[PDB]
Paper text:
The icosahedral capsid contains 60 copies of a protomeric unit composed of four proteins, VP1-4. Enteroviruses are unique in harbouring a lipid molecule (pocket factor) within a pocket in the VP1 β-barrel, which lies below the surface of a deep depression encircling each fivefold axis, termed the canyon. The binding of such receptors can trigger pocket factor release and viral expansion, leading to externalization of the N-terminus of VP1 followed by VP4 to form a pore in the endo/lysosome membrane through which the genome is thought to be subsequently released. Here, we have determined three cryo-EM structures following mixing of CV-A10 Kowalik strain with KRM1: the CV-A10 mature virus, a disassembly intermediate A-particle and the mature virus in complex with KRM1.
The CVA-10 particle seen in the receptor complex is in the native (mature) conformation and the model comprises the same residues. Receptor binding has minimal impact on the capsid structure; structural superposition yields an RMSD of 0.5 Å for Cα atoms between mature virus and complexed-virus protomers. However, there are minor conformational rearrangements in some contact regions, most notably the C-terminus of VP3 and the VP2 EF loop. There is a noticeable reduction in the amount of bound pocket factor (to perhaps half the level seen in the mature virus particle). Residues 29–322 of KRM1 were modelled and two of the four glycosylation sites (N45 and N59) have well-defined density for the first glycans. KRM1 binds CV-A10 with a relatively large footprint (~1400 Å2) and the first two domains of KRM1 (KR and WSC) span the virus canyon, each making interactions with both the north and south rim. Although KRM1 dips into the canyon it does not reach the canyon floor. The KR domain engages at the narrow part of the canyon, contacting the C-terminus of VP3, EF loop of VP2, and the HI-loop of VP1 from a neighbouring protomer. Notably a loop spanning residues 98–102 in the KR domain, disordered in the high-resolution crystal structure, is ordered in the complex by a strong electrostatic interaction between Asp 102 at the tip of the loop with Arg 239 in the HI-loop of the adjacent CV-A10 protomer, whilst Tyr 105, Trp 106 and Tyr 108 in the same KR loop make weak interactions with Lys 140 of VP2 (Trp 106 stacking with the side chain stalk). The WSC domain of KRM1 binds the wider region of the canyon, interacting with the VP1 EF loop, VP2 EF loop, GH loop of VP1, VP3 GH loop, VP3 BC loop and the VP1 C-terminus from a neighbouring protomer. The CV-A10/KRM1 complex we report here demonstrates that relatively large non-Ig superfamily receptors can attach directly to the canyon and drive uncoating even without penetrating the canyon sufficiently to make direct interactions with the canyon floor.
Numbering used by the authors:
A (entry chain C): 1 to 48
B (entry chain C), C (entry chain C): 1 to 240
D (entry chain C): 145 to 192
E (entry chain D), F (entry chain D): 28 to 68
G (entry chain E): 29 to 322
H (entry chain A): 2 to 17, 21 to 297
I (entry chain A): 150 to 199
J (entry chain A): 51 to 149
Write the structure that this text describes.
Amino acid sequence: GLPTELRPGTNQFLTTEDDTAAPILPGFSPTPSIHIPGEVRSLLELCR
Amino acid sequence: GLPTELRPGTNQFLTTEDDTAAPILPGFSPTPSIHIPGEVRSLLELCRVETILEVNNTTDATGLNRLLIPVSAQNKADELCAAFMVDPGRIGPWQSTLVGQICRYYTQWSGSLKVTFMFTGSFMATGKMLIAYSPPGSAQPANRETAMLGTHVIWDFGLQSSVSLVIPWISNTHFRTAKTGGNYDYYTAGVVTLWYQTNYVVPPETPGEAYIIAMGAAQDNFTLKICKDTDEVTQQAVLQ
Amino acid sequence: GLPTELRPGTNQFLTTEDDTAAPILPGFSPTPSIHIPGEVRSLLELCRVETILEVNNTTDATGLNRLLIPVSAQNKADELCAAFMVDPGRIGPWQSTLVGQICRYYTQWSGSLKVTFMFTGSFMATGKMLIAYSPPGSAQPANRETAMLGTHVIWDFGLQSSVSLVIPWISNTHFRTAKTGGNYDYYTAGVVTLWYQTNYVVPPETPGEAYIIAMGAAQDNFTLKICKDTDEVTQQAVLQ
Amino acid sequence: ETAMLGTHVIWDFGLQSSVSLVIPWISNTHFRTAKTGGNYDYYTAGVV
Amino acid sequence: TNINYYKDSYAASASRQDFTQDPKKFTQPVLDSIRELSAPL
Amino acid sequence: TNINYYKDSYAASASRQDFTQDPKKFTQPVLDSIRELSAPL
Amino acid sequence: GPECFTANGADYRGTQNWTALQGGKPCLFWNETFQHPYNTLKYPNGEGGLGEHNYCRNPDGDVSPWCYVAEHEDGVYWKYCEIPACQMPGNLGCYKDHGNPPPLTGTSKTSNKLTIQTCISFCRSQRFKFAGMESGYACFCGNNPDYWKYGEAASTECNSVCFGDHTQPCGGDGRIILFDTLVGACGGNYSAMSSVVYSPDFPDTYATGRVCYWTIRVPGASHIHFSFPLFDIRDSADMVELLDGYTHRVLARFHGRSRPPLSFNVSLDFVILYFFSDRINQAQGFAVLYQAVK
Amino acid sequence: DPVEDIIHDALSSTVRTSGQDVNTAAGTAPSSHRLETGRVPALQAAETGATSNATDENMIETRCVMNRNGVLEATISHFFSRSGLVGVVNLTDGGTDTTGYAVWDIDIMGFVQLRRKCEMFTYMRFNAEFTFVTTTENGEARPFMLQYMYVPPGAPKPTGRDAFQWQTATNPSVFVKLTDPPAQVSVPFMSPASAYQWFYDGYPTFGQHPETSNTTYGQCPNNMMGTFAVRVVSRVASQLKLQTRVYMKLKHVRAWIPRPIRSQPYLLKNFPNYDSSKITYSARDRASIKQAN
Amino acid sequence: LQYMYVPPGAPKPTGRDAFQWQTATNPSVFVKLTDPPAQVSVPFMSPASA
Amino acid sequence: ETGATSNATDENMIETRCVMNRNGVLEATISHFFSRSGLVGVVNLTDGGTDTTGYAVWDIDIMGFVQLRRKCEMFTYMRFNAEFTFVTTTENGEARPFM
Amino acid sequence: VYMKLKHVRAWIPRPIRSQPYLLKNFPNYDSSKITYSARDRASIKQAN
Amino acid sequence: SDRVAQLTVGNSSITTQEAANIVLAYGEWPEYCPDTDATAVDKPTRPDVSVNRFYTLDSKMWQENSTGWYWKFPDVLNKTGVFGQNAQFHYLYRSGFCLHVQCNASKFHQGALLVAVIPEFVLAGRGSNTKPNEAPHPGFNTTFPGTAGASFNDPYVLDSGVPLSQSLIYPHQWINLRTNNCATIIVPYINAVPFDSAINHSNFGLIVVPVSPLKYSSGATTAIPITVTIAPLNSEFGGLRQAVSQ
Ligand SMILES: CCCCCCCCCCCCC/C=C/[C@H](O)[C@H](N)CO
Ligand SMILES: CCCCCCCCCCCCC/C=C/[C@H](O)[C@H](N)CO
Ligand SMILES: *[C@@H]1O[C@H](CO)[C@@H](O)[C@H](O)[C@H]1NC(C)=O
Ligand SMILES: *[C@@H]1O[C@H](CO)[C@@H](O)[C@H](O)[C@H]1NC(C)=O
């Protein structure tokens, strides 16, 4: 195989990292959305 | 070597992931296939074919007669022949059709459903029938003048003894779920009820009873959702 | 480092995987080769060469005479000289040929098989023989008029004393498996049987018995399947 | 189940109450003769 | 885009999913392809 | 397409499989290449 | 001697109530075990040793003696019982196979309707005094006396059914059973002391008109004591005759109408067992047991 | 030309349902009332065996819906993509059991939940992805090592713990530890036939077949595909009660000839024997006919 | 450990040796306790649109 | 008798047919015939109180075990590269924290 | 200790040894027990 | 204009006037073995007329309390017809059948019939015992009834543990005594192997189940029979050998 080494910082469930995870339902199509008013996209939108 | 770190989610035999595994016979050629009919490629392909409902699923109806609803002449008109809840995932008649068995393997279902009704009476005996689907809400109606209001199809006998009703997919949401009861009856899909339109009029020297075969299936817009272990297996002993 | 996760199937010394390993002598030049005859590149190359069958594999036939079938004149005609089951993986005569030994290393086999029959009789003694392959079904036939019906080859003596029969690959499936017995005899490939066509006619002052050497091999369409530990080794003690 | 083996025609009733069978001309020779009996039954043409 | 780390074919996972549905094999397996809204008999 | 992570040759697994069969080396190792359907003697 | 004569354990009515000597299960009594198919309510008057006990019997026609036991979710509702006493004379036990070299290095064959006696008819046709089955389809003759080379094994897992008849065992896959050739035959001479004389074509039904003469010539024996543990004759024309050897004289007669006693002493030194049968209707078989006491 | 009868059929012996690729759900167009005779889609003839094509547009005043519901998850490829239990072994390596090994013949019919899925299709063809989870009877993992040899049909089966078959110079084997994530192996379609068969309306052999007990019935060997053995890697016995489940996935699946779903409970492994005394009726029993719950 | 998702309508497990753990359709996570935490992505599986 | 193989092909004996075969010969070549790993030797490093050596030497001889031996006996001269694998365990099959 | 063979090139095929092995570096068999390759049958014309 | 029907194979020529709509199993006609897939290296045989006839099985009478019947294919034809004498002499076999079943009744009678082919129609021992060596099993004559065709014992589960309610996934056609007195199916060769034995492996079954019971007012024909006429198409045979009965 490819040679490699594990750096530090492994096996740590970081609360705020952003990685992939195994999909649980392979080949899944969600319920298609609907145009709903009031779509907020920021919290600064609510501070104003 | 290349530096790396193991994220969480390792060493977990996920039942439904899709990864490679080491080939066990390296450099292997399989037995070449053969063109065989009946190659199915989808389960929606099997929901579009009719199978009989055990609509007469009553005590004192055992044997083969569960598949047949009786039909006799009615001296008094405005009579109720039969009725059944259309919910496939729910228990009831749809446990005997395929589309209700295969729906149980999934959670949610959508799309229109259709039922046919083959008449098995004599050639000379004739009669009109009213097939009324009622959307959800109250229970099944009391008299046919209350069951009119849903989508209904009126049926005349003669040749070509199989009419088709199609229950249109009406629902607030995009998908109803198969489980029904408690609060999941919010996804109930109404009740189909069959009424004597006029009568079962018979000539002399002919049997004054008959039967109808209620066959059901799914319309072309049938679509399904995530998988689910069915309920019709409760193996206790390991098979030896 | 790069993020990653270990899927299942790790740390497993799979006997048949195909991966790299750390070179033990870094920067090594081997001894340069030399052009040597007999470079084989396939095992099918070895199935196409004849080796003798121990068709006379009987009690009271010990020594070298297991490789030879007797042939004598028959006062009464319509006589059975010999017979053997064609199944190579099955025990029997094919344990002594290579193609039956090498087939045991694999599970399944396909392709036509062929057998030759060299005559070792005198030059003046002559005779006709019938070599009949019977497909599967019933057992070996009783009389030759029942063994005709399979593919058969009639043989005349003279010069050029080696005829060739080829058992055509006939089977419902694409591959028979080497194991035979129980329910695996569904993959049985019939029986080859050799009959006296006319007689072993001998002149005076000549021995009235002879022998035939049954040599077998595989036809060009011989193809094999996944590997298998053979049966002809049962080492008990470690070799010291 | 022994009379199947010849050429046979199966008939259903209903309207159009006349079916047609045709006995095909099968014979070793080109012409059968009208006389039948003795050795002239060599020209017999079967039985319907 | 799916990739296989071995030179065998049967180590892939979902190498080609396919949409191909033929209701005519099972739902209408009829010689005389009946009309869509007419009288069959 | 097969790849080696070392600068030596003998760390590869199946670097080139090959179909090459020569039955004439063993099955018919004859001077006078006999005819395919004639009398050899 | 054995408490059992036939190769399944039907006549076995032993005192064993366990299912094994090592690691034995306390077996449940036949009179509470009613959810299982065999009990004593719908079986009155003891069809197959059934009563108020927990002894392993064979009321189903199976290949072994067994009973019914529960489990701690690590067992099946029955269990084959191992009894070291019910090994019929003519059974050399069952042994584990290994491959090459075989213990019986005689002639090996294979069929698909192989019952037991078809091999014993085959090793007798080749004068090999021991036989061998492998998992109901394979035959294995041979004269070798070193069958014990690989190891003795229990008689429980040696019980894969024969393909010929589905009521008797023909060993296991990789496990051999060994039956002698003197049984399952007739004729010959018995110079041994206390051997066992079985029916022609035992365990099978005797064939259509099997007529043959046994010979028991013992040197200097005072009296010969016969017995009839298994003796079931159905047609009257099928008879068994104990003849004198010197003068060819009739001494006793048994057939389907004259039932046998327990035993009776035959006080001579050279006796002949004569057997004659009919073509039409057959019966199970008979087993006897002589004791030359000087 | 010599005779027309032989060239006519041979020329006319040539080959005698172009379905489209459906990516989404089926939409619908509107429809108005139509009051005309001669044209009726309701009054079909289900007696011909055909499905009635009474589409929704042709019955009621429908609307226009451009659907978007995905049909991806309903195909057979992702219907069998789930792994599932197949067998358990009981490698009871202790003081009493002087074997040290346990052999188990591969039979997926042993457990119902995976069985009932593949019964829907009579002929299947696929590649497998086996997974051997490993543990003790207490669920505990320990520092030990196991061996997992596949023993094809005809191979010598292992005889004990120190057997020579574990030399495995040809048989594929998996050497794995018990403190390890589960071993996972892909397996190809290794049938001698062209496709697997869960059913066989006959016998493997020729000859007579009795009518009192037919144990050879319905046993095709093309699917019967050998055994699979396990030992702990040790020449002397370590006292532990082991029990390893084996799981498989089905990939690259191709089905054929759909079969109804079995409703009655299973009683045996290789035979679909039900019980006449307890016929499990598929539908639940209702009160009367006109009392939909 | 074993971690099976039991959707609505599925048979719920009854005990430790239950047949529902055969999980031929239900997604399950088989994981060890000496393991970094198991992590799984889950889609929007509502019957509704939101 | 000339030592040649008879070339009596199937077409030349019987009324054959047309078959365009597809059975793969990939797995029968020598490259994938020896690709299987296999046992070669065992060592007995009996490190204890009695045995005051602490080491065990083993000369490489693949002839020691039959199942790999009988394969390479089929070919008189061979040339290859090897991929050794040293599985490690105790007599009880137990793994331990050692080096 | 286990080994694999890769990049193999053979030469001069040799028959397969049938007799059991007795030594390591010498192919010594035993004259007293010649293991016959084929299993012993009943007679010549009795294919099992 | 559609009720009539004329099928003629071989020297036979069947006609039905009231029944309508031929249903073809799975939308593929019966065809010969292609060159690129066959394994039997020898030439197979194509009689195409002697064997491709409409052989008629025996009549089975329908009573008001009847249960059902079934057959097996090509098992029903091994003692009769040239096809019988062709299957006993050949190890290999391939054909595609043209089923056709008839049930005549008056316009005053009532009743229906489910006709369906069942691929690989195994049967099931009818017993609660799970002892492996004492397992109930169907006899030979029960699973291979021959030309006569045995009856069911519990048709609601097809004597195989499969509910009849779902039995329409298979190719089928309903006989219903108000509109059609007959039915027909054209089925191809369905087998995972290109050829098979003819006296060991039955390719498929056939079921004729009285779903709706025959009911008539008293004073009419009481004995209603059922006949099935069968006809192989594109038959094949290979591997000639001696006779084999079973
Ligand atoms: C060393 C690797 C061990 C894993 C390999 C074991 C062999 C796996 C072959 C899979 C064969 C197809 C799946 C088997 C299904 C059923 O057992 C049979 N079809 C009939 O019962
Ligand atoms: C530190 C690495 C340890 C592994 C290296 C050990 C040396 C391996 C050399 C392999 C030589 C060829 C294979 C040997 C085969 C037989 O032993 C000999 N041909 C004769 O017995
Ligand atoms: C077995 O032996 C006798 C009865 O046969 C009795 O004394 C003993 O307690 C029995 N044991 C069991 C476990 O039933
Ligand atoms: C059942 O049999 C056992 C053993 O003989 C006996 O102890 C018990 O009293 C019996 N019970 C009944 C109800 O007969």
